Amino acid sequence: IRCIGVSNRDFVEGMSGGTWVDVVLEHGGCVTVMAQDKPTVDIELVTTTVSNMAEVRSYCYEASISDMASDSRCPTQGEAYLDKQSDTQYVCKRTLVDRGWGNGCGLFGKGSLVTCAKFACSKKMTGKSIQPENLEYRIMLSVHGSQHSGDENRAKVEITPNSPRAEATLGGFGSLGLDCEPRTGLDFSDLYYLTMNNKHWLVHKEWFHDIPLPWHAGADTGTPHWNNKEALVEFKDAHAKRQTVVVLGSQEGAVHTALAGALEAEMDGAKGRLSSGHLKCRLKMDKLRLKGVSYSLCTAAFTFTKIPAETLHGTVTVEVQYAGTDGPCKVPAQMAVDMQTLTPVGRLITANPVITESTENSKMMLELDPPFGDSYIVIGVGEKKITHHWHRSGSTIGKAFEATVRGAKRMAVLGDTAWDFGSVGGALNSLGKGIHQIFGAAFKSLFGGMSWFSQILIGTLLMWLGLNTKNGSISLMCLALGGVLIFLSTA
Amino acid sequence: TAAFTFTKIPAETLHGTVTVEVQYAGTDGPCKVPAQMAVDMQTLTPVGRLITANPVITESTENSKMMLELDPPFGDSYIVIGVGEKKITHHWHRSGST
Amino acid sequence: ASISDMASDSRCPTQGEAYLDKQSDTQYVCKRTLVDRGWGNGCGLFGKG
């Protein structure tokens, strides 16, 4: 529930620590955590809001110019000086002009001309600094059980670095403890929050500082003072006897293409909502109980109300309607083959299905994991058990291949953190995570300033290099190539 | 034996040490502050070093304040303050390596 | 030369950069540097302001 149709959901099965399971929550999909005798819980990260950001260096992308003026000197005099060069609101430029004996200077060299124009800025854009503190994540979790396809089954958890751990209380189901890592989530110490005109981005530092545009420096208080004041003013000169000042055009469509690989964000009031990150939580399910045990079996009748449907991962959701007034009651349901010997094959994802109301025609939804052959969804007790025919497509080998592809994509997206998704904890997992940290630091230092094409080019180049170098470094090249080219062809 | 609150944050100095400022709500008189740096909240095993004294609150009033500084390990960790079921915790990440 | 009424402006480690209103005046010499800050000084963060 809440994760049935996500198409990017991940199943975290069982626990070997007995109590807790690590998990990395991402904005794209969600995680269904299923223990041995505990209810399946679907956990998703919904929003990350950043609060009270501090302004840094608003740039100016649309300039306007004003009353130009100029000054000039005979070929053998000093240099031209306009009294508006002592004003920090004027852009001024000095050049040499052909002068003499016709213009009113008796000498024939090159005189000095100074032209000044008053600079004003419309439509500054502004960046703000994010600190890993005062950054809040919202986690929504829900429980399986009695909920129909459409409150003791859902919970919302707010997590900030001040309170990184929380407990979601699900009445009658107990409570799920989460200890999470909010600081090291998405690196918000190199990322500014940029706004141009009611459009906000998550932008890297050291891109918001190498921009060639007239920039203020934080606290705009009175008369704004733009520092570069050029990069929007072009000083042309006519045939050695004039000078002209023009402004460059509005620069907002050049920045839109300069941004590429910078995340979009939205803003509510003083807070900025990001819809792309990843949090890491350890889930302590040791106070999670099964509400439904010690219930008598439901024996009246069951009718399929929608149909059995297949999610994108192979599981089967089934919505049933119960006819008898029995009360809180446990639903018999299974997957079977050879309906003479009803031997439970496959696994059922709902931890325990239970009908929780005492009315005539109640509704419930369960989900189950069928085997790969043809099978029968059997729901009922005896002489009134409805059976639906089910057919699952692909053998176990395809499942293992898809699992490796998902793992590779998760590694390419999360970097080293990918080793923490089933991180119950072993020497092998820790060794893999460590050597991946070393190799990731090295790879990000060497490469990582490339963008899907520089990486493809260098990948093909090094691929030829390792293919025909004939030394023992063949393997080093080809492995770096595996890395680069998959980093390209998986995103 | 009372509850602590984080008055500001656990700031990070330039050399990696954390400064934590805590507020005490109980009135037990001069009493030791139970503070540690831990991972795996299940088994609270003290990791890192606390470059502070066996931190103590001096006053005996309703709300008092304390500042202690810690030398945490290079991984992610949790500042654990308090004894049980009231121990506030903060998430803290250190960058360097040995 | 002769010098006159000095003034200064400081900011916390994670803010923008300091800006005096007398930087937009072409009669003042201004210099910008980094200063130790934090908690004691009165701004809560410990970097260089």
Partner: antibody, heavy 127, light 108 residues
Framework: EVQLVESGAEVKKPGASVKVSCKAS????????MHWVRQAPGQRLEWMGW????????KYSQKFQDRVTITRDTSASTAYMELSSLRSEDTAIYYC?????????????????????WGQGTLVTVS | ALTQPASVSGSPGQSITISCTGT?????????VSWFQQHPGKAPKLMLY???SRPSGVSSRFSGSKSGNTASLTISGLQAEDEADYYC??????????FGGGTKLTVL
């Protein structure tokens, strides 16, 4: 303990100049900076400036940059504030407040508890 | 220079809050926020410094908070001897002090 006592109230016609003292007792006068704060009748408080009693540096507010001079007398443990060219707006109460000076002898950053002790006040009436 | 409410009233026994809105140079960026209480006739008395922190001989009822550009003084358990003027002050980034407009609290 710490006691800052100012001179008594004073009445002056416009155009004149007032000089109000602030005698400090109960602490080392040389290691503190004295601020002067003016409060209009039933209005906000106005910070006017400070003087570092150690070396003698002063800093005045922009509103009084060229109307106020603050001096000190260490041997007598006094801080004087002189305001010239009085106006009808200057009818207000003048307080003096201490603040600890850094251990290096400079007063760049103030200590978190700036105005821990104040003076009783002195009414200057501009008629 | 600091935006403070004109007056605030509350019945004895309940909590109340006085806000103080400043800019990114005085209250927004610095923990240099102080609250002074002034009974009529007497000089102001430092009730809170360092935002939350408060002096030695001050009742624990006064609390301080800060969010963005707004500081806030909270008085829980409003007693009798609380009718006075409350002023917020801040040390600006440029090295000057600014005070608040003033709030007259009435315990009724």
């Amino acid at each position: 303990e710490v006691q800052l006592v100012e001179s008594g109230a004073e009445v002056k016609k416009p155009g004149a100049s007032v000089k109000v003292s602030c005698k400090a007792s109960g602490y080392t006068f040389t290691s503190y900076a004295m601020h002067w704060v003016r409060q209009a009748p039933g209005q906000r408080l106005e910070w006017m400036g400070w003087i570092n009693a150690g070396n003698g540096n002063t800093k005045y507010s922009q509103k009084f940059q060229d109307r106020v001079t603050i001096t000190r007398d260490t041997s007598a443990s006094t801080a004087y504030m002189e305001l010239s060219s009085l106006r009808s707006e200057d009818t207000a109460i003048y307080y003096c407040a201490r603040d600890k000076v850094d251990d290096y002898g400079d007063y760049w950053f103030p200590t978190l508890w700036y105005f821990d002790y104040w003076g009783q006040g002195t009414l200057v009436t501009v008629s | 220079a600091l935006t403070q409410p004109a007056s605030v009233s509350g019945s004895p026994g309940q909590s109340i809050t006085i806000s103080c809105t400043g800019t990114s140079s005085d209250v927004g960026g610095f923990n240099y926020v102080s609250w002074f209480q002034q009974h009529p006739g007497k000089a102001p008395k430092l009730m809170l410094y360092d935002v939350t922190s408060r002096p030695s001989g001050v009742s624990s009822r006064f609390s301080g908070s800060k969010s963005g550009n707004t500081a806030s003084l909270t008085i829980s358990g409003l007693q009798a001897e609380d009718e006075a003027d409350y002023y917020c002050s801040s040390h600006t980034s440029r090295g000057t002090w600014v005070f608040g407009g003033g709030t007259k609290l009435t315990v009724l």
